Amino acid sequence: MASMRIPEDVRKDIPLTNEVIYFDNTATSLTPKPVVEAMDEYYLKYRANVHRGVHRLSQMATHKYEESRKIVADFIGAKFEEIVFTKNTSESLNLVALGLGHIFKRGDKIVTTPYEHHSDLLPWQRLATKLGLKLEFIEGDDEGNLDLSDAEKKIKGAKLVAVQHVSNALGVIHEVEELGKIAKDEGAIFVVDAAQSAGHMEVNVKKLHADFLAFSGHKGPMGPTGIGVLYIREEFFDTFEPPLIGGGTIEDVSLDGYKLTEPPERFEAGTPNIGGAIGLAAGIRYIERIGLGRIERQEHKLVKRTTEGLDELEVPWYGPRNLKKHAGVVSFNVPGLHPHDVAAILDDHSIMVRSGHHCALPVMKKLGINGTVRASFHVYNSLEEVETFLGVMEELVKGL
Amino acid sequence: ASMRIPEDVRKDIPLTNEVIYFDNTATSLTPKPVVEAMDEYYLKYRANVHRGVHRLSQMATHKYEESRKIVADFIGAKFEEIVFTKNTSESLNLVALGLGHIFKRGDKIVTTPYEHHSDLLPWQRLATKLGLKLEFIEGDDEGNLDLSDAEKKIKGAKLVAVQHVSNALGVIHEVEELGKIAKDEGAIFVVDAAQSAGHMEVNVKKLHADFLAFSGHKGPMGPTGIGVLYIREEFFDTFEPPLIGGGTIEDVSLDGYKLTEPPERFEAGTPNIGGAIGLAAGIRYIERIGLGRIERQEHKLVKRTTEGLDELEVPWYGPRNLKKHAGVVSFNVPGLHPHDVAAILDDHSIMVRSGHHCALPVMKKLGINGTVRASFHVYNSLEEVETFLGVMEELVK
């Protein structure tokens, strides 16, 4: 944290900030020039494959790649070797299902939240349907709040528990420390989908009691696309069956068979996205120079004014009224308009917002609604942007 | 077509001024214009994807669709047969898992003996696991396949998996012929095109390909983290997606899921939008040059390299027939371990790989310590080969 000005100093580094009001941060973040500069120095000044090749470019590439992995480890409070690069969260999550499927005896149980993004349920659905498991969901309200007692009940007996850290559609910050304690207490394996928290707030494997953790570099960490992370705790290195296998993943091969290498290269099949990982590390550097603390507060501040303003205007919004449990995402609807129409109207005013089911149709169904419109923030978003949003919403609403 | 001097091309690659990069089968050097294409996504139209209403997502989606269409045309495939992955090895692994459900114990798979671990281990595991017959087509130590032994091994296998080119030796296997055999015998044909893809013509129809994998960071002069899996139209109701979730569905509930149409059915999560656009920029850059001109320039490099090594009497490997030798030449200095040779070349600003090369039954085949590999692309020049021979001369004394 090098004391400098929020949001302006971050805005200085993101040209799109002068062009549009970008409230679509849960879809993906905007990307600061230093993140793109860090990638461009890889591609133009030390371009090479890794795997400890002798020549000097590959030394650099390899150094830079392992630096990236250490930075990603430290960001999340893990050990170097516990970190696996993937293309995205979704890959990471599918890898947990495909990795561990051999452990599951028929009639074993898995438990998750009802609010999951599609990539943290239907891998668990496929696996259940395939193996004859019981897939159980813990109760909670329309506001997003989990029934913790029902959790303590439903988690009793489970071989595995999978939960989102924050919901991409409601903005619920679930109480995953409590949820983790409870899974640890009850023996179960705890897998945490941290896609919408990573980069926006503290995600630490120790505090969260996590055995598996997934996030995407293109969201809150301000990294490029094509770079996810999968955390695998040391404990599971001799249970977890590498789903992807090939180049970079062995110490000897023959036409007969194979013998695998150590983590983390055990789980990384082929040429990794070295460019992406270096981009990702620059994002995390960018983030920890700002401070998770300062990012939290900005976001919280934009949510408070957004929610007050929408209250003033007779516009209903979803997720926790208790803003301590509300991430930098506010979903909402204008009665009389479809969400896609609200979002086209905002787009006409250069305000970017998502509309539809947000890859979380179950949520939409639990609320009895045909989609929502979604404004989501990051630290580079400003109160002026919010105000000009509430302005057009106001013109919108009293045009009905 | 069209319209330029090789080797320049060099003009777009600053590193070409600092070093002689002869490590192209590992990864390619990347032209400024490809990086420029990615930079405008990240700085001028950054967004997902999934036809979202705002103009950035419109632009990004349009450009991502464009990207897929360009890849499709590059290999003569249809839009919806192209799935994006992180690399070749994901693509091949995805083929293993994507139709493991069609095999039964005692069904046979056939490969080449050479042969990248990424086009081997997912077949070795899938055989051990389901109790399958795994059989290797015969070839000599130059790497030329016996096409007679091909004809008797393809009859009657469920699938055939071959390199288009070896990354150790540089053989171009005669895959239009292997595809014909597989087709005639009714095997599913999978082609690992990780070494052919931006150096020579690769065309799914000509190849009789049912599945095809390649990597953007190699020959297509694209970024890292982007790979392609071609799935022919005929396997859409057979092939099950091993990765599923966001972007993969028509409807979902707590009860279950219904999947979407291809290609998006096989693409889970936010794709690497950046890499896709970059890869498209790469193939655009390659098409502007011409694959025939790339083939010819690599061929000159290989001709002068090998005929110069003959001159120095250093042993080299792969087909003596240059028609059947890609832009890679593995060699060794008798009494020098390959890493020392590579260390010495590096000291002269010459980048080159050494070791087993994620190949290995080749390093046994063909029993030897390992090999030093110089590999090429269109931006490499004769004068660079010439100076490489010069330090080889000095080293041989």
Author numbering:
A (entry chain B): -2 to 397
B (entry chain A): -1 to 395
Task: Please give sentences taken from the publication describing this entry.
Sulfur, essential to many biomolecules such as sulfur-containing amino acids and cofactors including iron-sulfur cluster, is usually mobilized from cysteine by the pyridoxal 5′-phosphate- (PLP-) dependent enzyme of cysteine desulfurase (CDS). ToCDS is a PLP-dependent enzyme and the crystallographic snapshots of catalytic intermediates of ToCDS showed the conserved dihedral angle rotation of Schiff-base linkage relative to the PLP pyridine ring as shown in EcNifS_CsdB and XometC, which implies the PLP-dependent catalytic mechanism of ToCDS is well conserved.
The crystal structure of native ToCDS (NAT) was determined to be 2.6 Å. There was a dimer with a twofold symmetry in the asymmetric unit. The larger central domain having PLP binding site contained residues 17–285 and comprised nine α-helices surrounding a nine β-stranded, mainly parallel β-sheet. 5′-phosphate of PLP was tightly bound via hydrogen bonds with the nearby residues of Ser87, His215, Ser213, and Thr268.
